From a paper:
Additionally, we applied the UVC irradiation to the protein apoferritin (ApoF), which is a widely used test sample for high-resolution SPA studies.
To do this, we used the protein complex, apoferritin (ApoF). Using the same UVC exposure time as ICP1, grids containing apoferritin were treated with UVC for 60 s on the carbon side and 30 s on the copper side. These grids were subsequently imaged and the data processed using SPA. The UVC-treated ApoF sample resulted in a 2.1 Å structure indistinguishable from an untreated published map. A comparison of the map resulting from a UVC-treated apoferritin sample with untreated, published maps found no difference between the two structures (EMD-3853, PDB5N2717). At resolutions of better than 3 Å, structural damage would likely be visible by the lack of disulfide bonds and damage to aromatic amino acids. Our experiments show that UVC irradiation had no impact on our ability to obtain a final structure of ApoF at a resolution of 2.1 Å. While there are no noticeable structural differences in the samples used in this study, it is important to note that undetected damage could be possible, and that this proof-of-concept study does not guarantee that all proteins will behave similarly.
Residue numbers in the entry:
A (entry chain O), B (entry chain Q), C (entry chain A), D (entry chain J), E (entry chain W), F (entry chain E): 6 to 179
Write the structure that this text describes.
């Protein structure tokens, strides 16, 4: 119960929202992990898709860690939840994985936007700045990159052209 | 259904056991993550406990990844499950965290030993070698290190001596 | 007849099996040699297929040499046999060569697995360790790589697309 | 009585066997020490035989130390015994010393093989791996080297040719 | 049937003769391989004989490869045959191995001379130049070196003097 | 029986005394070896005590070797005896180990002093100089260092303070 000695201008609702966001970032890490190893299957075998999604997975773990650090910086208390498995076991194709990643990042961005709204409603400028500085432009860049990737794959003839996915793997992700 | 072109001498039971082990390693990663940020709380404030457990968390993620790679190398199919949250939100003390980590690593080791027994019963020497080479001695070393740590903390007067935990933090984990 | 001064715990059946395995490795070297120069024909002209299979040929000669060294280390006696010519003179296509290499490596792996079973039945842990350390994971990696290659070529449109085989030659084997 | 906190899957019989093996390695160190200084006598005066056996003596001390470390890693308890003096005070000749070293290393290897059998019967894969990784191939290499040395000395005309032992000292051990 | 686009002034008899020569070079590689590991036996133990013959074995594999490349350069088609095992399993002595190698190289040289005669009869100056440039002087040098070696071993008292073979191993092959 | 060609002014009693001293130095090496691994136990876990005593163990082996060399330099003949196991299996504490080491080094010093008395009574100045130069001041320094260590541990509150032994381990032995 008793307060943290550091706590100031940090609403309990913001504290809870940061714990939800921690879960979401870990969930995103897990989705990209799954995607990565899909492309490492002997019957998929797109090694640069695999590295690309692994890198993205590790990023998301870093995003989670930074929110954990924030929780403590502000005197909130971290409460972890189960990290749900991804929706898919088999991601179908390079294009479909990229489409799923785009939708994931748009979902993560919507959560961060709700979090910023809350921080604004509770007049927490430090939390607003945090989210703006470390998260919002990362999301906009990730979303733009994924859209670019989907566009290229589509134009190249994916998913039906295995050639298209192979060449994208070498030229864009390589 | 149809076979993987790479698959040879890889029993379905071993395939399932590797998927269980993947979950366990990710679970271990999560426990150490939680422990790490506990020591980063302003009311705990043992920064080298925090770094030590973070490093251990990242290790475990690497151990999971290597099993995922193995699954694919052998032509098995990765099936992920929810990563359960840790048993504890509050780890009590440096000593109690170390005790919990020891019990975690002994549990992980017991799983790997059951996995090796299975691999032996199914006459899978490649899988036996894998487990021996990459996992079993890591576990024995981790277990020994954690026991050493618990011993020192106990001898120093933890958990009642906050001095003991502070000085261990600086001299052993620092 | 009279024993080797070094010989210990080395069954005559293991000695014979190692001589068979020596022949098999040299045979594998010969198959890859043949494949290599097929891709060097003026009417095939895929120079990176050619280098890839030449490298694999030299590897296999090294694998044979290490078994010869082992035979002597254990006090067995090397008995060489004719190295049979490969099954094919003309390997048809990049894809078909890769398919044949996959089947070759799976055959070599099955032989090594039978050899390990024998070594296990004769309670020869040094020989078990030898095979595990120097051979079994090499086979699993070779098999996985070849499967990956076959998958890519298939997805790209080989063997009918001469473009697919040309581009694979440059991007994967180059 | 009470258990070690680290102990897992480590049979008391294996614990005792490791203590016996520790004694044997120290015993081997002592035999090579004695051999070394024999060749340093003014009436023997083969300085490279002396260095060769001293190096081998120090190796064996390292092999003992690694088993001591293992005992502790696994939660067993080290119990030392007297290190018996070697069988011989006077080793007769370079050839006879080499012959005695060959028989010593074959004895040490037989002990390690019995130890591996025990570890296998008690389903201790970590201990099996330990012995395989750190000991069995060292023994096979040592045995092969000693056999090679005995062969050369014999072919050269030792022990009757003092010239043979002198020249072996310079060309093989030098 | 249909011609190679590159083929010019390349008689079918020369094409067949190059395929025979390819087999012979691989056969020579195999003889030297066998010789090499004979000297690696614990009861022979002449390590520089072993390295010398291994080097010669690898050379011969290179000589085969260059003929394979030639076949393709000229638009002929490679047809491989079984590589026969060597005549001997046990090479008796350093001197006898050297004598056998001399006879092998003289046989290989006689084949190359017949090949040059054919190339001359078919007015193939490119093939004549090839053989002259890459093969004939190599043979003359190899033959001279082997004769020199046999002479020295004979003068030193081989094969009865094990000392002679030991010292040759160190001073000439070392 | 017959004399060594090198022997001069070297009494048989001195020869025997040097053989006894060789045994004592090896015995000291063994005591420190045992002490070292005691501190490596998971329930003791003082790693710098362990390194300190291991270093001391290796020193003593060097002291033995130098006496063996001396025996031969003077034309005496080395006669080895069993190296007795240490008095203790369990050394109780850092303080008690240090106390036992102090008593060991004082015993070794008393032996060397008796040896010097003998060398003096037999008018062997070379042996007197040997002992003075290589042994007596080493003993005085070792004894002083061990006394210093015991004093510090005692003042710090050992053996009851596990904190004291931990901090000594880091600051003095570290
Ligand atoms: Cl607040
Ligand atoms: Cl609030
Ligand atoms: Cl939950
Ligand atoms: Cl930007
Ligand atoms: Cl299977
Ligand atoms: Cl199955
Ligand atoms: Cl689940
Ligand atoms: Cl280790
Ligand atoms: Cl045997
Ligand atoms: Cl047998
Ligand atoms: Cl045959
Ligand atoms: Cl691997
Ligand atoms: Cl146990
Ligand atoms: Cl037990
Ligand atoms: Cl005893
Ligand atoms: Cl080896
Ligand atoms: Cl023509
Ligand atoms: Cl023609
Ligand atoms: Cl044939
Ligand atoms: Cl010349
Ligand atoms: Cl005298
Ligand atoms: Cl006297
Ligand atoms: Cl005795
Ligand atoms: Cl001083
Ligand atoms: Mg959520
Ligand atoms: Mg891969
Ligand atoms: Mg990202
Ligand atoms: Mg994120
Ligand atoms: Mg669910
Ligand atoms: Mg989706
Ligand atoms: Mg910014
Ligand atoms: Mg589980
Ligand atoms: Mg902090
Ligand atoms: Mg770890
Ligand atoms: Mg793990
Ligand atoms: Mg739950
Ligand atoms: Mg717990
Ligand atoms: Mg290992
Ligand atoms: Mg065969
Ligand atoms: Mg070419
Ligand atoms: Mg290969
Ligand atoms: Mg092979
Ligand atoms: Mg045939
Ligand atoms: Mg085929
Ligand atoms: Mg390995
Ligand atoms: Mg014994
Ligand atoms: Mg000397
Ligand atoms: Mg050795
Ligand atoms: Mg040893
Ligand atoms: Mg006795
Ligand atoms: Mg003997
Ligand atoms: Mg090894
Ligand atoms: Mg022929
Ligand atoms: Mg050798
Ligand atoms: Mg040559
Ligand atoms: Mg040739
Ligand atoms: Mg035949
Ligand atoms: Mg012959
Ligand atoms: Mg020339
Ligand atoms: Mg004594
Ligand atoms: Mg330790
Ligand atoms: Mg000392
Ligand atoms: Mg001493
Ligand atoms: Mg004592
Ligand atoms: Mg002095």
């Amino acid at each position: 119960a008793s307060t943290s000695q550091v706590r100031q201008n940090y609403h309990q609702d913001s504290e809870a929202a940061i714990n939800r966001q921690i879960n979401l970032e870990l969930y995103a890490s897990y989705v990209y992990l799954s995607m990565s190893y899909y492309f490492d299957r002997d019957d998929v075998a797109l090694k640069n898709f695999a590295k690309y999604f692994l890198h993205q997975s590790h990023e998301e773990r870093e995003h989670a860690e930074k929110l954990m650090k924030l929780q403590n910086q502000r005197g909130g208390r971290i409460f972890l939840q189960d990290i749900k498995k991804p929706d898919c076991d088999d991601w179908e194709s390079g294009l479909n994985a990229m489409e799923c990643a785009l939708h994931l990042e748009k979902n993560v961005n919507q959560s961060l936007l709700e979090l910023h709204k809350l921080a604004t409603d509770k007049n927490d400028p430090h939390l607003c700045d945090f989210i703006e500085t470390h998260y919002l432009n990362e999301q906009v860049k990730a979303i733009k990159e994924l859209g670019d990737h989907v566009t290229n794959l589509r134009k190249m003839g994916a998913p039906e052209s295995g050639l298209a996915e192979y060449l994208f793997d070498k030229h864009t992700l390589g």
